[PDB]
């Protein structure tokens, strides 16, 4: 999930854009 | 500003800025 990829580990623009609509 | 640990409201704020008019879904699981 987003928390594991961006909060407990360092986020990235690629990862954020995975969750855009 | 996206290459860091983003938690809670900080993460939701980053999604809001990045996704813009596309919107986003936030699923903390």
Curated annotation (Swiss-Prot), chain A:
**Highest taxon of source:** Eukaryota
| Cysteines joined through disulfide linkages | 6-11
**Which stretch of the full sequence is covered here?**
90 to 109 of 110
Entry's transmembrane regions = none
By what name is this protein known?
Answer: Insulin A chain
